[PDB]
Motif scaffolding. Structure first.
Motif, PDB file in Angstrom:
ATOM      1  N   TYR A  78     -68.420  24.804   5.549  1.00  0.00           N
ATOM      2  CA  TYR A  78     -67.864  24.024   4.378  1.00  0.00           C
ATOM      3  C   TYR A  78     -68.617  22.839   4.302  1.00  0.00           C
ATOM      4  N   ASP A  79     -68.898  21.934   3.377  1.00  0.00           N
ATOM      5  CA  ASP A  79     -69.748  20.834   2.893  1.00  0.00           C
ATOM      6  C   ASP A  79     -68.847  19.748   3.455  1.00  0.00           C
ATOM      7  N   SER A  80     -68.929  19.157   4.659  1.00  0.00           N
ATOM      8  CA  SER A  80     -68.348  18.118   5.013  1.00  0.00           C
ATOM      9  C   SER A  80     -69.297  16.953   5.399  1.00  0.00           C
ATOM     10  N   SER A  81     -70.274  16.625   4.366  1.00  0.00           N
ATOM     11  CA  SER A  81     -71.216  15.373   4.431  1.00  0.00           C
ATOM     12  C   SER A  81     -70.544  14.176   3.609  1.00  0.00           C
ATOM     13  N   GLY A  82     -69.624  14.429   2.542  1.00  0.00           N
ATOM     14  CA  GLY A  82     -69.028  13.343   2.172  1.00  0.00           C
ATOM     15  C   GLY A  82     -67.813  12.685   2.541  1.00  0.00           C
ATOM     16  N   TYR A  83     -67.259  13.274   3.626  1.00  0.00           N
ATOM     17  CA  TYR A  83     -66.365  12.811   4.352  1.00  0.00           C
ATOM     18  C   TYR A  83     -66.159  11.321   4.862  1.00  0.00           C
ATOM     19  N   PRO A  84     -65.233  10.525   4.400  1.00  0.00           N
ATOM     20  CA  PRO A  84     -65.535   8.929   4.898  1.00  0.00           C
ATOM     21  C   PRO A  84     -64.847   8.915   6.391  1.00  0.00           C
ATOM     22  N   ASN A  85     -64.842   9.787   7.328  1.00  0.00           N
ATOM     23  CA  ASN A  85     -64.188   9.657   8.545  1.00  0.00           C
ATOM     24  C   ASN A  85     -65.295   8.948   9.648  1.00  0.00           C
TER      25      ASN A  85
END
Ligand SMILES: *[C@@H]1O[C@H](CO)[C@@H](O[C@@H]2O[C@H](CO)[C@@H](O[C@@H]3O[C@H](CO[C@H]4O[C@H](CO[C@H]5O[C@H](CO)[C@@H](O)[C@H](O)[C@@H]5O)[C@@H](O)[C@H](O[C@H]5O[C@H](CO)[C@@H](O)[C@H](O)[C@@H]5O)[C@@H]4O)[C@@H](O)[C@H](O[C@H]4O[C@H](CO)[C@@H](O)[C@H](O)[C@@H]4O[C@H]4O[C@H](CO)[C@@H](O)[C@H](O)[C@@H]4O)[C@@H]3O)[C@H](O)[C@H]2NC(C)=O)[C@H](O)[C@H]1NC(C)=O
Ligand SMILES: *[C@@H]1O[C@H](CO)[C@@H](O[C@@H]2O[C@H](CO)[C@@H](O[C@@H]3O[C@H](CO)[C@@H](O)[C@H](O)[C@@H]3O)[C@H](O)[C@H]2NC(C)=O)[C@H](O)[C@H]1NC(C)=O
Ligand SMILES: *[C@@H]1O[C@H](CO)[C@@H](O[C@@H]2O[C@H](CO)[C@@H](O)[C@H](O)[C@H]2NC(C)=O)[C@H](O)[C@H]1NC(C)=O
Ligand SMILES: *[C@@H]1O[C@H](CO)[C@@H](O[C@@H]2O[C@H](CO)[C@@H](O)[C@H](O)[C@H]2NC(C)=O)[C@H](O)[C@H]1NC(C)=O
Ligand SMILES: *[C@@H]1O[C@H](CO)[C@@H](O)[C@H](O)[C@H]1NC(C)=O
Ligand SMILES: *[C@@H]1O[C@H](CO)[C@@H](O)[C@H](O)[C@H]1NC(C)=O
Ligand SMILES: *[C@@H]1O[C@H](CO)[C@@H](O)[C@H](O)[C@H]1NC(C)=O
Ligand SMILES: *[C@@H]1O[C@H](CO)[C@@H](O)[C@H](O)[C@H]1NC(C)=O
Lengths: 110, 104, 126, 52, 52
Positions: free
Chosen positions: C106-113
């Motif tokens: 899954y695209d987890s690039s834009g997660y601000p973590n």
């Protein structure tokens, strides 16, 4: 497609609760549940406070609480101390693999 | 209701059987006949994909315009499918214990 | 405990190029994202593009395309930013942070973590 | 033939003869151009000018 | 600017709505839809699979 709306500064005496809010476009905060807050001490790197809308990581006590309502994401602090003299920054996923950050609030202890 | 789906293996949406698992075949002796297993308990299955930009519209004539794959925004992930483990395991186990009636 | 080390302060002139290097130690950096932020003293945070060290994929933000380049180096576990055509307002401090987990599903690039941050490099012009 | 002493409701804004008329005219207009000439090679750039 | 699992750019040229000019357009075709022609190791001149 500018930065998130956020007030300039806040204030409050120790011993009570302070609520801060960040509002944005419906395609930014009202569509996805990926928002977070950052505490910025002046002089060094910041530290993440909560992961999701409401998710507490390890190493931080149960004192911050996050919530979302419509287009507004809110963070509540209870029991103010003198270790909160730092900036606060909102952040949100804006779609198309781009993260939009907020303006910033300064809190003072009277 | 008959849903005219297209699938080579692993029959998708359709009417289920009753009682127990049922096996259908033509002769059950030769290897040239495709044998069909009709289940009783459904098993969930999902399939996903990464993002694409849009339909890039390319015009090659007076009104004949086709749509090709444009850009890709984000990372590159592989389009996969997911099936629950224990449901598939006991479904194939029920298929085996009911197929053991025709092979002693 | 893992650490992120960066380069030192830089004094430059407009019309030049600046390179900022960030090195991660203590963990497998290939399975994690790397994000970049820039802080001029006086206003809030701003977000730059992310690098995928497992494949070299780049995706910068708006009003930054064509002047900033990011390159991973898996041999010595570093990440380089090359920014050209600096202006007067480019005097700032740069931070590198660790993003989400690369999952290949899954695209987890834009997660601000962003969990761990570096000390930052102070670049200035005159 | 005229009817004697009966009344009848009438509504022309919701009628089936108008829709069938429109579909018949559309289909018969589309049918008469089937064996006709196609203007495919006339998409060339036209070098146009005023007459002398 | 990166590595994709199964896609190629495959920029080509095609005729526009006017039968005079040709313009360069790009796409993103999958690897099973792309077949190399000739025999040599020049991995540039690919072609569509169903045009054979
Ligand atoms: C189809 O099915 C497939 C199944 O095959 C689905 O794929 C799976 O999808 C899920 C998401 O639903 C993924 O879960 C995610 O996993 C990541 C990775 O976590 C693993 O690695 C952690 C790191 O440890 C490794 O690295 C260090 C580095 O040195 C090594 O030393 C270690 O040895 C490890 O190699 C590790 O800590 C994790 O352990 C945790 O989980 C296990 C599970 O069994 C527990 O036992 C442990 O006790 C521990 O709890 C794990 O091994 C997670 O990080 C993800 O959680 C983050 O994201 C959540 C959502 O955002 C968030 O809520 C969480 O709080 C968590 O937050 C994290 O965020 C940042 C990530 O970098 C960091 O700040 C920080 O780490 C923080 O913790 C999430 O759980 C599966 O990995 C994935 N499977 C595979 C094989 O990739 C697929 O989704 C399905 N398709 C569908 C549904 O469409
Ligand atoms: C997957 O890729 C698509 C590519 O189209 C992404 O959709 C695009 O998302 C951006 C987000 O910023 C949209 O931009 C915004 O659109 C609104 C529409 O009202 C506009 O008001 C804003 O000013 C801004 O331009 C863009 O329109 C949208 N594209 C389309 C065709 O709708 C999508 O976000 C990607 N998926 C994920 C999860 O990121
Ligand atoms: C439109 O242009 C064409 C030429 O492109 C004209 O055709 C010419 O007409 C003159 C008449 O004096 C002849 O002498 C030429 O031999 C013609 N050239 C051709 C046929 O190539 C034509 O007359 C123009 N149209 C009008 C209405 O004047
Ligand atoms: C044109 O199509 C024919 C099939 O009708 C191709 O012949 C076979 O194609 C398959 C699919 O790639 C190959 O694996 C085989 O090696 C081909 N040859 C044989 C003898 O089966 C043919 O290759 C196609 N033309 C080109 C240039 O690829
Ligand atoms: C498949 O299973 C789900 C959940 O059990 C059910 O809601 C759905 O109706 C089933 N579909 C068919 C075609 O049996
Ligand atoms: C197919 O069935 C018939 C009768 O049921 C039988 O005579 C025949 O031998 C079978 N074919 C094979 C290959 O066993
Ligand atoms: C009116 O209807 C009656 C029905 O009983 C019929 O006998 C009579 O002829 C009608 N009037 C006229 C003018 O047709
Ligand atoms: C494609 O067509 C254009 C038409 O102007 C031509 O200029 C070009 O040389 C052709 N070939 C390639 C490889 O672009």
């Amino acid at each position: 497609q500018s930065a998130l709306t956020q007030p300039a500064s806040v204030s409050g005496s120790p011993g009570q609760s302070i609520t801060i809010s960040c509002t944005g476009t419906s395609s930014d905060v009202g569509s996805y549940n990926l928002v977070s807050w950052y505490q910025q001490h002046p002089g060094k790197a910041p530290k993440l406070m909560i992961y999701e809308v409401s998710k507490r990581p390890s190493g931080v006590s149960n004192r911050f609480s996050g919530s979302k309502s419509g287009n507004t994401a809110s963070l509540t602090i209870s029991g103010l101390q003198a270790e909160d003299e730092a900036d606060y920054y909102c952040c949100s996923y804006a779609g198309s693999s781009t993260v939009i950050f907020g303006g910033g609030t300064k809190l003072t202890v009277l | 209701g008959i849903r005219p789906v297209v699938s080579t293996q692993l029959l998708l949406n359709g009417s289920l059987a009753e009682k127990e698992i049922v096996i259908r075949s033509e002769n059950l002796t030769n290897n040239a006949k495709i044998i069909i297993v009709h289940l009783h308990t459904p098993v969930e299955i999902v399939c996903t994909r990464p993002n694409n930009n849009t339909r890039k519209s390319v015009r090659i004539g007076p009104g004949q315009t086709f749509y090709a794959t444009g850009d890709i925004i984000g990372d590159i992930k592989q389009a996969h499918c997911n099936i629950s483990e224990e449901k598939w395991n006991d479904t194939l186990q029920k298929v085996g214990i009911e197929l053991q009636k025709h092979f002693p | 405990q893992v650490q992120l080390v960066q380069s030192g302060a830089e004094v430059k002139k407009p019309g030049a190029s600046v390179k900022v290097s960030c090195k991660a130690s203590g963990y497998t950096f290939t399975g994690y994202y790397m994000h970049w932020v820039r802080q001029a003293p006086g206003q809030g945070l701003e977000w730059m593009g992310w690098i995928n060290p497992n494949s070299g994929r780049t995706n910068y933000a708006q009003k930054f395309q064509g002047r900033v380049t990011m390159t991973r180096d898996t041999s010595i576990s570093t990440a380089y930013m090359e920014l050209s055509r600096l202006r007067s307002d480019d005097t700032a401090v740069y931070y590198c942070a660790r993003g989400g987990w690369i999952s290949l599903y899954y695209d987890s690039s834009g997660y601000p973590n962003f969990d761990y941050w570096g000390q930052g490099t102070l670049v200035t012009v005159s | 033939l005229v009817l004697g002493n009966v009344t009848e409701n009438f509504n022309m804004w919701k009628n089936d003869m108008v829709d069938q008329m429109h579909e018949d005219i559309i289909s018969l207009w589309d049918q008469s151009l089937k064996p006709c000439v196609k203007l495919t090679p006339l998409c060339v750039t036209l070098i146009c000018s005023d007459a002398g | 600017s990166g590595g994709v699992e199964e896609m190629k750019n495959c920029s080509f040229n095609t005729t526009t709505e006017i039968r005079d000019k040709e313009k360069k357009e790009y796409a993103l075709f999958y690897k099973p839809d792309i077949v190399p022609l000739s025999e040599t190791n020049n991995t540039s001149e690919y072609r569509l699979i169903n045009c054979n």
